[PDB]
Amino acid sequence: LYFQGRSYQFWDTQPVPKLGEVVNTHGPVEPDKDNIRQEPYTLPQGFTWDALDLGDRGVLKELYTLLNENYVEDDDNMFRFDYSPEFLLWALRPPGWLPQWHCGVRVVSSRKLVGFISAIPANIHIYDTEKKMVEINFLCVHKKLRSKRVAPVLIREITRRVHLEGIFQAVYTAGVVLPKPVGTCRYWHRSLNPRKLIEVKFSHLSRNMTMQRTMKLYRLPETPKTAGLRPMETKDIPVVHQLLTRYLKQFHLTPVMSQEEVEHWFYPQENIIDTFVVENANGEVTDFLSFYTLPSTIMNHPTHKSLKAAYSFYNVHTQTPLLDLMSDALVLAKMKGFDVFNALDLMENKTFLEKLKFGIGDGNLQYYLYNWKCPSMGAEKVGLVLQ
Numbered sequence: 001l002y003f004q005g006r007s008y009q010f011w012d013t014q015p016v017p018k019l020g021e022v023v024n025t026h027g028p029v030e031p032d033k034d035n036i037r038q039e040p041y042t043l044p045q046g047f048t049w050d051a052l053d054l055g056d057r058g059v060l061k062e063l064y065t066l067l068n069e070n071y072v073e074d075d076d077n078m079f080r081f082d083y084s085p086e087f088l089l090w091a092l093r094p095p096g097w098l099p100q101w102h103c104g105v106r107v108v109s110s111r112k113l114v115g116f117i118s119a120i121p122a123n124i125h126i127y128d129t130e131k132k133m134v135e136i137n138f139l140c141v142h143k144k145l146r147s148k149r150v151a152p153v154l155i156r157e158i159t160r161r162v163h164l165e166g167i168f169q170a171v172y173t174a175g176v177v178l179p180k181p182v183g184t185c186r187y188w189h190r191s192l193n194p195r196k197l198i199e200v201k202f203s204h205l206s207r208n209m210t211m212q213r214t215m216k217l218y219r220l221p222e223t224p225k226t227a228g229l230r231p232m233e234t235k236d237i238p239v240v241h242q243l244l245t246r247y248l249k250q251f252h253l254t255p256v257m258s259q260e261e262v263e264h265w266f267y268p269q270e271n272i273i274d275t276f277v278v279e280n281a282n283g284e285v286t287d288f289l290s291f292y293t294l295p296s297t298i299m300n301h302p303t304h305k306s307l308k309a310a311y312s313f314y315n316v317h318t319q320t321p322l323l324d325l326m327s328d329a330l331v332l333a334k335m336k337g338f339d340v341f342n343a344l345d346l347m348e349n350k351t352f353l354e355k356l357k358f359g360i361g362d363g364n365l366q367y368y369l370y371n372w373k374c375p376s377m378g379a380e381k382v383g384l385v386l387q
């Protein structure tokens with residue numbers, strides 16, 4: 001059985017392994033290029049490239065609107081991600097960000113923004129190799145421009161722009177199956193406000209249960225249990241960096257963060273990123289938990305307009321049991337007004353998902369490397385979370 005809906009006209013031309021090729025080697029698919037195309041790729045007539053300065057508030061709003069109206073939706077068209085402008089700044093301007101890697105497509109005549117793709121730099125540990133790579137995210141084509149082969153042009157153009165800076169590998173996640181996943185993860189969900197989630201058909205009411213009984217089943221403590229939990233502060237930057245660096249060594253695909261990157265990714269910003277640390281009776285920070293804020297717009301519901309979701313980010317345990325840490329994460333999310341807590345089955349997350357009453361969801365998230373041939377891994381060896 002060859003075809004399963006995709007004969008990969010674009011992807012078969014790219015330096016990636018074929019779907020169903022078993023990989024036993026480790027290394028690049030093609031050599032580092034010593035001459036790179038200087039000219040942007042040709043777009044269809046009436047469209048032009050534009051590098052978006054997200055420090056211009058109006059341009060940031062334009063990107064916000066493109067994504068708010070055209071980024072990831074569920075298959076029944078009830079929910080769409082609603083990344084805030086300030087979130088987008090957090091995700092797209094980490095240390096080493098470049099304006100040319102905020103790659104937009106605009107209509108020539110009206111200047112309307114109809115396409116986007118982004119690269120951010122990251123050091124990536126893949127098995128026994130550490131490479132400088134980029135992370136690709138926020139690939140989006142306006143709904144009215146769909147299936148016109150614009151996505152391959154966006155992909156080739158960010159590839160060129162990244163090659164110009166001397167980087168020849170990338171890491172990316174998507175919901176679609178492409179040549180070739182290095183790992184596959186599943187989304188899991190922990191109800192915090194089950195009433196609302198049942199009302200908007202995110203969850204279903206179980207066979208023999210009432211609304212009041214489902215509320216009781218998912219009821220959480222009013223405050224966390226772990227001794228010495230508190231918000232991350234500036235003084236915790238070094239130890240958070242140390243804890244994460246050491247904790248991530250056990251996995252096979254991880255970021256390798258500088259202290260400035262740890263500051264950027266974890267230092268709390270209201271309604272974007274939350275990090276809590278465990279400072280013990282000695283004064284030592286031994287664990288931390290983190291989650292980011294990503295609501296989804298709710299279409300076609302009479303009462304509820306926004307689904308408030310917290311996403312598990314990086315959780316490091318050395319002295320507090322992981323089960324207790326995540327229990328505290330759920331409590332903190334509840335306290336802050338989240339409707340649901342989402343997590344993937346990567347890292348050690350399978351050790352707590354069922355025990356803490358997460359339900360499995362519909363969506364697979366595929367992890368990919370560009371121009372790096374290595375064996376695939378189980379979800380539990382994946383130690384990388386992209387927003």
Ligand SMILES: CCCCCCCCCCCCCC(=O)SCCNC(=O)CCNC(=O)[C@H](O)C(C)(C)COP(=O)(O)OP(=O)(O)OC[C@H]1O[C@@H](n2cnc3c(N)ncnc32)[C@H](O)[C@@H]1OP(=O)(O)O
Pocket residue numbers: 006007008009010011012070071072073134136137138139140141142145146147148149150151152155158159162163167168169170172173174175176178370371
């Ligand atoms: C060294 C540096 C390298 C840097 C680059 C690294 C690689 C980066 C790779 C990008 C990582 C992105 C990370 C994220 O942001 S993942 C999030 C992606 N965004 C969305 O899902 C938002 C909603 N959907 C859309 O806006 C559009 O439908 C998109 C833009 C996704 C496709 O637009 P459209 O629906 O109008 O289609 P087309 O006619 O233009 O093109 C169809 C072709 O594109 C292939 N396709 C479809 N979806 C994806 C996808 N998510 N990754 C890679 N390829 C994808 C498809 O197999 C086909 O190719 P082939 O089957 O013929 O081969």
Ligand SMILES: Cc1nn(C)c(C)c1NS(=O)(=O)c1c(Cl)cc(-c2ccnc(N3CCN(C)CC3)c2)cc1Cl
Pocket residue numbers: 072073074075079080081137138173174175176187189202296307309342361362363364365386387
């Ligand atoms: C409440 C809700 N809102 N919405 C819009 C949805 C679909 C749900 N249901 S869901 O919670 O179970 C869920 C969730 Cl969050 C996300 C995805 C998904 C799918 C494909 N790509 C991505 N990304 C791509 C790139 N980024 C680095 C990572 C994101 C995410 C699928 C599901 Cl099915």
Ligand SMILES: [Mg+2]
Pocket residue numbers: 141145146147148149150151
């Ligand atoms: Mg298109």
